[PDB]
C-alpha cells in the first residue's frame, strides 16, 4: 500500500507537469536569478509600466481595467488547465458528471490561489509566464476598489510559501482540494470522500518523505484550506462591489458560470 501510494504520488506529479506550464520550480528559478531566462521586467509604478509596454507584451483602457482583463484571461486559462488536471485524478471521471461540475466549480479558485502563491513573494507576483514581475505596491495603488483585490492574496501567499512546498507536494495538495466531500450540492458524497482519503494518505507519505524535520507539515497544509476559503469568499464579495459600481464589468462566460450561485 505504501508503494501504490508512492505510485499515485508519481502519477499526480506527472499529470501536474503535463497540465501546468509554469510550475513552482520555474517561478522560483526566475525569482532568484538561477535561470537562464532573462529577468522579468519589473512593473512597480505607472511609469515603468509604460516603459515595458513599449518593448514587450492600442485598445487603450484603464490600467486598473487592463489588470482586470489580464487576470480574467489568466483565470480562464487556469480553469482549463485545472480541469485537464482534474480529469487525471483516479476515480474523478467516473463520478456523476454533476458532481464533477460541482467540484470544479467550488475548487478551481482555491487551486488558482494555491498555485498563485508559487509565483509570489513579499514584494510582487510574476505575470505573463515570467516575462514580467508586478509589485504588490503597484497593484495596491490602482484606484478604488481595484487596489484591494491582490493584497489578501499576497498575505495568504507569504503564509503559504512559508511551508516551502514543491511541485510534488502541490500536485497532491490540489488533488485533495478538488475531491472535497463538503462541496454544496454533491449527489454522491461517498465516492468523492473515498478518493480523497487515498489522496490524503498519499499526501501524508509525500510530505513525510520529502520534508522530514518539518514537524506537522501535513496539518499546517490542511489548515491552509480554510485560508483559501476565506479568500474565495472575499474575492466574490469584491467582484460584486465591482459589478455594482463599475461599467462593463462583465466577466467571461465561464467565470460567470462558475460564480453563478456560488455561496
Amino acid at each position: 500500500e505504501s508503494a501504490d501510494l508512492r505510485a499515485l504520488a508519481k502519477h499526480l506529479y506527472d499529470s501536474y507537469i503535463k497540465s501546468f506550464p509554469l510550475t513552482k520550480a520555474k517561478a522560483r528559478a526566475i525569482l532568484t536569478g538561477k535561470t537562464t531566462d532573462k529577468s522579468p521586467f519589473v512593473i512597480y509604478d505607472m511609469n515603468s509600466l509604460m516603459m515595458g509596454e513599449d518593448k514587450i507584451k492600442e485598445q487603450s483602457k484603464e490600467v486598473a481595467i487592463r489588470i482586470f482583463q489580464g487576470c480574467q484571461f489568466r483565470s480562464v486559462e487556469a480553469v482549463q488547465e485545472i480541469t485537464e488536471y482534474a480529469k487525471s485524478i483516479p476515480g474523478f471521471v467516473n463520478l456523476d458528471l454533476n458532481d464533477q461540475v460541482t467540484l470544479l466549480k467550488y475548487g478551481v479558485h482555491e487551486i488558482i490561489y494555491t498555485m498563485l502563491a508559487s509565483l509570489m513573494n513579499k514584494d510582487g507576483v510574476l505575470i505573463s509566464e515570467g516575462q514580467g514581475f508586478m509589485t504588490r505596491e503597484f497593484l495596491k495603488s490602482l484606484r478604488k476598489p481595484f487596489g484591494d483585490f491582490m493584497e489578501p492574496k499576497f498575505e495568504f501567499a507569504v503564509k503559504f510559501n512559508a511551508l516551502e512546498l514543491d511541485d510534488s507536494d502541490l500536485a497532491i495538495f490540489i488533488a485533495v482540494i478538488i475531491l472535497s466531500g463538503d462541496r454544496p450540492g454533491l449527489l454522491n458524497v461517498k465516492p468523492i470522500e473515498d478518493i480523497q482519503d487515498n489522496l490524503l494518505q498519499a499526501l501524508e507519505l509525500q510530505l513525510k518523505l520529502n520534508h522530514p524535520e518539518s514537524s506537522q507539515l501535513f496539518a499546517k497544509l490542511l489548515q491552509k484550506m480554510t485560508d483559501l476559503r476565506q479568500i474565495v469568499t472575499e474575492h466574490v464579495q469584491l467582484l460584486q462591489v465591482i459589478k455594482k459600481t463599475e461599467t462593463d464589468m462583465s466577466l467571461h462566460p465561464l467565470l460567470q458560470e462558475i460564480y453563478k450561485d456560488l455561496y
Binding site: 480553469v79 482549463q80 480541469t83 480529469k87 471521471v93 458528471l97 454533476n98 458532481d99 464533477q100 461540475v101 460541482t102 470544479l104 466549480k105 450540492g185 462566460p253 465561464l254 458560470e257 462558475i258 453563478k260 450561485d261
Partner: peptide
Amino acid sequence: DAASKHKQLSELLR
C-alpha cells in the same frame, strides 16, 4: 441538473 447549469465546464469535461 448541475451539469446543465454549467455548459462550459461540462464541455471542458466531455
